[PDB]
Amino acid sequence: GSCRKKCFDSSHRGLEGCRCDSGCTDRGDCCWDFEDTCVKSTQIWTCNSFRCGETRLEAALCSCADDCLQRKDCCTDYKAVCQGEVPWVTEACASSQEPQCPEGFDQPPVILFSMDGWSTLLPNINKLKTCGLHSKYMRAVYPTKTFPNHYTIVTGLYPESHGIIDNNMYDVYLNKNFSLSSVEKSNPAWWSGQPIWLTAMYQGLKAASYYWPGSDVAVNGSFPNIYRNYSNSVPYESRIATLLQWLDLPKAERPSFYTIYVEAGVIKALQLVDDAFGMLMEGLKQRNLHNCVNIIVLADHGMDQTSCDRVEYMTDYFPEINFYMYQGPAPRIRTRNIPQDFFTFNSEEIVRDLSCRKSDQHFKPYLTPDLPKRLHYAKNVRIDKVHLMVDRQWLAYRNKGSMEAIFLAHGPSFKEKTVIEPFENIEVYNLLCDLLHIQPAPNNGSHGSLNHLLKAPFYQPSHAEELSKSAGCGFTTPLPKDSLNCSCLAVNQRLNLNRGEVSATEKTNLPFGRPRVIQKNKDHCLLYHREYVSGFGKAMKMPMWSSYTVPKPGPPTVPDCLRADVRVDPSESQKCSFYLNIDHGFLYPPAIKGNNESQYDALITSNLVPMYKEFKKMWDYFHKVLLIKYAIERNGVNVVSGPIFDYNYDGHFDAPDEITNYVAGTDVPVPTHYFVVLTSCKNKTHTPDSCPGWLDVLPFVVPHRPTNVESCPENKAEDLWVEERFKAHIARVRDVELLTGLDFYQEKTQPVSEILQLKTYLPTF
Template identity: 50%
Template sequence: MASEAKNGSTGRDMQAEPMLNSLDMAEETVRAAQTRKKKKSSKWKVLSLVICVCILTAILGCIFGLKPSCSREVKSCKNRCFERKFGSCRCDAACVELGNCCLDYKDVCIQPAHVWTCDKLRCGEKRLAGSLCSCSDDCKDTNDCCVNYDSVCRGNKSWVEEKCEDIQTPLCPAGFSRPPVILFSLDGFRAEYLQTWGGLLPVISKLKQCGTYSRSLRPVYPSKTFPNHYSIVTGLYPESHGLVDNKMYDPQRNALFTLRSAEKFHPSWYQGEPVWITAMNHGLKTATFFWPGSDVKINGTYPNFYKEYNGSVPFETRVMSVLKWLRLPEDVRPHFYTLYLEEPDSSGHRHGPVSSAVITALMKVDQLVGLLMDGLKQMNLDKCVDILLLSDHGMEEARCENIAYLTSYINSSNDYMVVYGPAARVRPVQLPDEYFSFDYAGLAKNLSCRKPDQHFKPFLKQHLPKRFHFAKNDRIESLHFYSDPKWQVVKSPEEVKVCNGGFHGSDNRFTNMQALFIGYGPNLKHGLEVQPFENIELYNLMCDLLDIEPAPNNGTHGSLNHLLKHPVYDPTLPKELFEPFQCSVIHGARVKGLGCSCDSLSETGYEKQLTLTPQQESDTKKLNLPYGRPLVLQNSSYCILYHNKYVSGFNYNIKMPMWSSYTLGKNVSTVC
């Protein structure tokens, strides 16, 4: 039984074992499935975590390490201009209308067509069609970089940031066999402007510091734009070169010259030889971007490169054109250049010389001079080119109460008109019939000393101060009005439309008429201030810089040698053939029949007057020969005759003085 029981129990166990195994297997399957599920869940968690980390890394990279490229991609137009690829903002022309342009759209995509400079946003840009210049990485290779590319995009110093350097010989790049010369005019730049506002003009102030500078340049009379610009390039006074004013009449041709008429292009108005023609006559090439007379066929020719005057041409375009000419191949590249800007003259006329508008204009032209200097530096020409930076005249403040009306002194007449201003002239109405026959002298007499406080004086032109050199030309009317400082002469109040602002044209010695002069370059002295001089001397100076022979002119060749490091002209002064001797009184040497009478003073009395002590001779020489004795170049002997009030060079052959020298004391009277 026991055996059976045992066997029975064993049978049940053997039957239960497969059942347990099945349950175990089911449980194992469940547990395995749960384990696989857990592993799969963990795997996804890890994968999700990895993805999150990657996304976070990318975000942090954009924020910190890769911020510029990400922001350019999403928020900047850098290298995306006018592309049809849209990020969070657009850079095509339609974005303006849609209102979803990137913030830098105008700066990066529009401004390059209007400006000649780089900024940080443009550095490394893709070259855009229509851009004035490029800030791309390859602009050096294509020779179209903006002038400040090196300083803004490459980290180099701009020209104004460099220290002054005194060099003894020109440092020119290959292809420049001689230093170019640039004549640069800032119209109406009063000499005082630089002294007063120099702190706002860093570029011009550096040129002054590093170059040759004069506190003022004396214009010719009248101190007007056309006469002075043409005197600068010819070395002639207006009476010699024919441009006697901005408005003038030629009785020979019965023609009227104004700045707005086609008549100004007629070559007959322009006499003398401007420096661009002198240079061309010596085989050099010239280029002018505006200068009075440069767009006229003078002596049958124009400059090799020139522009007909158009005041609307942007100043930057003018400067960049000169730089473009300097990049031409050597066989066609000019040697001489002119550059002209209307400012600060225009602002001075409209608002007066003491105005915020003039200060703004001064700062603008300073930037333009800087544009030129940066361009030269980028071309390695800043130590090669000689530059004359100057102006034609100054500017005076106009006031309505400082106008003298001729109708306040005499009755009005329809027989004549007045070319009004500070150097007013009378012109008959009947032209050309009465141009020479009009009663100028009678009108001058009627207008002389009419009032104690009269602020002008009438002069027949031959009686004007000789220092004006303003008489020997038919285009100068016979009757002239000389005005006090700050004053102008007009025929009647009806002729005045605007009486405030600024004007010029006055006496060329008046302080506010003085002009600017700075010379800078390898052939001009470094850090030198010189005494003021007349602008007619500049023609000879430019010829010396170009190493050419000047045409005949009113200047004194060699008078500006002290501005040059290596003067090319050595003037030889004429010598007297005979040294004068001391005059001695010859008794009885009277000449009869001279048609003159003498007073009752005895011969002994005359001899006493002519016999001076050594001290008296010394005193009269100091007083009456302050600049030394005049030289006599004629083949004739003479003696020096000393008087208490004058000194004479007496010629025994002709029995009369060859010259007399004396000094007039200051007239303290203020009465006419």
């Protein structure tokens, strides 16, 4: 009596002879349900009253026919609409402590989903935040652009190592230009590293991708098992349908890993992605995979903070511009005559000619090795030596003419209804390998940092083993053999600590244990003093590390007083005669703790470090003024200071053969940087030496430069720029560990996963 199961027929059988052929419309003969059962049905992605139980239509997008579940072509809403099942979205939160996977699903699939652009508007994505796990903000690496950041996510590498350093670049060795508009975007030579899809493939699993930076590229001569060449033409429902077809594949061909990228009427648009998301969840429920699949969603909440009013122009700084400039928020300057003049180009002159030019200046030029070490944006030919650090909300241009994502995770392997602390996206790749049970390729994340996101972590982190044992530097005589051309016109026994006195300074000044030398054949020895403990590097004739616990405060430094260390061989120690531009500085501030005689333990050749006159200014101000301010704020603080040698700017400590500059006429190396790690306690009620809970860290990797041009100190007193400079060079503990070859807190009564959490936390400013 209607169009049901009779769509396009010579049948006159109807209500009062109503028809169901395509000509019924113009005749007015259609049965009331014609359009819905026969016409709109072939063009929607959802079942309804008319479609439930329909006779299969070939022209149709999905199916609502009785055999659609067996045929695997139902619409996502089939079970809820046609079988009255409670949809995933309305259904209560899942408690699954183990993956409830269908037969064949040996290991739960991983879906990495990225979106861009409260709750009642987006119900599906909200249910995920609600039931699952979400991170406040997910820290993006420099430059903070989407395209490189997406490749970092899947590779675990910093842009300098994976190759995609910006959307636009020129490699001199290729003599090729990369841009997203170019065919060169597809050239595999640009793409370094090993993306998660390859890792899974190389390790037996199969991987698919419905768009993601580099998934439509034969990276290391291979594409993912299933991939789609980038195009914004395809509707979201068709993408989600394909994603589900891939999961409907036979075990043999069926991928274990999936990547899917998606990019007032803003809400209308967002709702379309939430609907597509809800389609994916419904599809999974209908497959019994909703409590099997581990799904991660990244929602870039980043906004364009730029304005045409907040733009800096190079025309204001140069009378003539003959250089090429990569414009915008992370600018880079190069020669126009490429490749010919690429390495000859005076990059140093450009930084100089742009340095402290205006008082209001909304950018700071840098040579890539002088850039803040935390950024890891220097070790690649693609990264031009000239780099401009533009202020937030500002842009820099030739002439007149940023990712911040919310990490969401749902699935049986993930912790339920948990808010997790912000982390860097470099960490994610190991998590992906753990979720997939594969071995991660060498990356920059620290394995086990994100174990707190997992119900049952696949990888259990372990403390790095020391490769060099401390040796020598025992107290033999209280009088030194060689004077070392040193002078103190005004004791050495105070350097002779007994087993009990040693244990006392170890308890107080090495509360989390001593840093471990993760360096092969590095000749060192520890020196024990009442107020401090240093780790003395014999070949460099200076201490690699120095440890001390400054207690909460309630005194000048002893002048013209210096003497040889009676424990350290003259062959292995610095002489006063080496100095006379670059002068000796105290790694450990002598006046920080104790009385006038406590200072004598610090007025020795073992506490001397080579410093530029201008650096010493900053160094001394921090130790005389800023440190005491912090020690009050934090109720004591454990300070670890030390030299850093990273001449090839690869973010690791230098091998001896890598150090290029020394103190004139000597073999004492000039540190490229200095580090200061402020380890105090989170619960301020306890001092750092007596803390049971978590520690609060504050690490600095400050460049050891001969002039303070960076700080632009022009007449200003230290109270105006030194702190600003120190804060400008903040970095993770792990950043230090890498640059030094030392390993911190190997004696803190917490699991390695938890310390790895702290060693990756970057302080916010």
